[PDB]
Symmetry: C2
Subunit: 290 residues, 2 copies
C-alpha cells in the first residue's frame, strides 16, 4: 500500500540494496511499473517530475497511483516528487498526497541550499512526508553537516555522474571511496541521479526501430552495482524506461502504416518498459524484498 | 458531474440535437475529450469498449473518469459501456459505476436479442443505470415492438452504415425516411454506430505522416447532420479520434529520431484529438448546451 518514502529506503539502507525510483507520465508507464513490482516481489518507489505533474495534473497523478495501490495492496509504494524546484511545489505535492518530496537546491550555495531544504523538511515532516535533497563532487564533511542540520531523510550526493549542476563532458566515473565516506558520515539512505544504464537490448530495440541515440551512453550496469555496494539505496530511473517504451511505438509505426489502434502501439511498449523495470529491480537487489 | 446516460440523451431527444459518444483507452484520450467538452460547453458521453476495460482495468477506467469529473464538475458526463456482449459484462460495469451500458445482441434473432436486452435492462434500471441496445436494415415496426417490450432507454437501429452484424459491400447510405419512421414509432433517443467521418484535415495529417488508410472512407459530414435531423441523438466516435491522435505520434517519430519524451509525442496527439471532438460537438449540436 502507499507508505512514506523513508519506510522503503531505510530498509534498503539497513540491508544494503538499491530501490529503483521509476518515473511515470501517464497510465501506461504506471501500469508497467506496478506489474514489474508485482512480478519481482519488489517495493515500488514511484516518481513524478514537475513536468509530469503539469502534464497529468497532480490530482490525476496521485489518483492513478491510489487506484494502482488498491489493485496491488501487498506492494509497498512511495509516491515521490522528483526534482521539486520550489517550496511551494513540494507543499502542493504534500497536500495532494505524495509520500516523499525532493527539493533540488543543489545549484545554490551551501547556506541557501540548507536553508530551503530545512524549510521543506519542516513542512513535510509536519505532514508525515519524507524528504530528499541534493548536494555537490560532494565534500563528505559538508554532506555530514548538511544532513545533520537539515534533518533530511535521504541525500543525492554528487559522486561522479554528469547531471544537473554537476554536468561534465567525458566518461562518467564513480568515486566509490567518496561515496563510502559520505555514507559513513551521514548514515542515511543515499540517492543516485543521472545514472541511465541503457541496456544493450533496449538500445538495439530503439535503433532497430529507426531511432537515433546520438552518442548518448549512460553508464554500465557495473556502475550501478558498485554504487549500491557503496551505499546508494535509491536509483532514479526514467530515460531507460522512455527509450524502451518509445522503441516499441516506433516499431509499430514502421511495420504497419495502417495501424492506429492505440493499444497495438502501447501494449508492446508497456511490456518493454515492464521488462526494463523487472531487470533493474533484480540488478539493484530489491527483488523478493516484500 | 457524472450522470445517468438518459439524463443527457433525453434532453438531446427533446431538443433535436446529437451528442458525440467518444471512446477512450487511456489518460491522453480522456483528457482531450474533457478539454473539448469544457471548451465547447458541451455535455460528454464517454465510452469504453470491453477491450478498453480489459486494457485499463475497470477500476482505472471509472477512477480516471471520476477524477476528470471533479476537475470539470459543471459538465454533464455519462460513462458508457460500448458494445457490451454479455449480461455479466454489463453487470460488472454497473457495479463499477458506469451510468450507461450497451448490450449488443444484434447478431441474434429478434427473440433472443429482446430476451438478453430485457434482462440487462431490468438489472441496470434497478441500479439507476440507462441501457442501449442495437437492432437490424431495421424494420421500424420491429423496432417499435422491441423498445416497448424491453424498456430500453436508447436504440441503435441499422439505418445504412456497414457495421457489426449489418456489414455490406458498397457505399453506405442513410435511409432517412426509415430513420424518421423508427423515430416516430419508438419516441426514444436513437444511436448511430459505424459512422466514421475521417475529416479531410485528419486524413491529410495521417497520410502526410506516412500512414495508409487502407481504402477506408468516412461518411460525409452531411451524413451525420442528416442523421441528427432524422432523430439520431448519440453518435459513436472512436476511429476519427484514433487517426488524428496517431497521425501526430507518427509525425513526431518521423521528424526527430532521437525523441523519446512521451510528452513530445502525446501533447500534439491530444491536441489533434481534442480538435476532432470540438468540431464534432459543433457539427452535431451539443456545443453551448451546458
Ligand atoms: Na528525486
Ligand atoms: Na455503444
Ligand atoms: Zn538531481
Ligand atoms: Zn453496433
Amino acid at each position: 500500500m502507499l507508505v512514506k518514502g523513508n519506510e522503503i529506503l531505510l530498509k534498503a539502507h539497513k540491508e544494503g540494496y538499491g530501490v529503483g525510483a521509476f518515473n511515470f507520465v501517464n497510465f501506461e508507464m504506471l501500469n508497467a511499473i506496478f506489474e514489474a513490482g508485482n512480478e519481482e516481489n519488489s517495493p515500488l518507489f514511484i516518481q513524478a517530475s514537475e513536468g509530469a505533474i503539469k502534464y497529468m495534473g497532480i490530482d490525476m497523478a496521485v489518483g492513478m497511483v491510489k487506484i494502482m495501490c488498491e489493485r496491488y495492496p501487498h506492494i509497498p509504494v512511495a509516491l515521490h516528487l522528483d526534482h521539486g524546484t520550489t517550496f511551494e511545489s513540494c507543499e502542493k505535492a504534500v497536500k495532494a498526497g505524495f509520500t516523499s518530496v525532493m527539493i533540488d537546491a543543489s545549484h545554490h550555495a551551501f547556506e541557501e541550499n540548507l536553508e530551503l531544504t530545512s524549510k521543506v523538511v519542516k513542512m513535510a515532516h509536519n505532514a508525515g512526508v519524507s524528504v530528499e535533497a541534493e548536494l555537490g563532487l560532494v565534500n563528505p564533511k559538508e554532506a555530514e553537516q548538511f544532513v545533520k542540520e537539515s534533518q533530511v531523510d535521504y541525500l543525492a550526493p554528487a559522486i561522479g555522474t554528469s547531471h544537473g549542476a554537476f554536468k561534465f563532458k567525458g566518461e562518467p566515473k564513480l568515486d566509490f571511496e567518496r561515496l563510502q565516506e559520505v555514507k559513513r558520515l551521514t548514515n542515511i539512505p543515499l540517492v543516485l541521479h543521472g545514472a541511465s544504464a541503457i541496456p544493450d537490448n533496449v538500445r538495439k530495440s530503439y535503433l532497430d526501430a529507426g531511432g537515433d541515440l546520438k552518442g548518448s551512453k549512460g553508464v554500465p550496469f557495473e556502475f550501478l552495482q558498485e554504487s549500491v555496494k557503496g551505499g546508494i539505496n535509491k536509483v532514479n530511473t526514467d530515460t531507460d524506461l522512455r527509450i524502451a517504451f518509445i522503441a516499441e511505438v516506433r516499431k509499430v509505426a514502421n511495420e504497419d502504416k495502417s495501424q492506429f489502434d492505440l493499444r497495438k502501439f502501447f501494449s508492446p511498449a508497456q511490456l518493454a518498459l515492464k521488462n526494463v523495470v523487472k531487470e533493474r529491480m533484480k540488478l539493484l537487489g530489491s527483488a523478493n524484498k516484500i
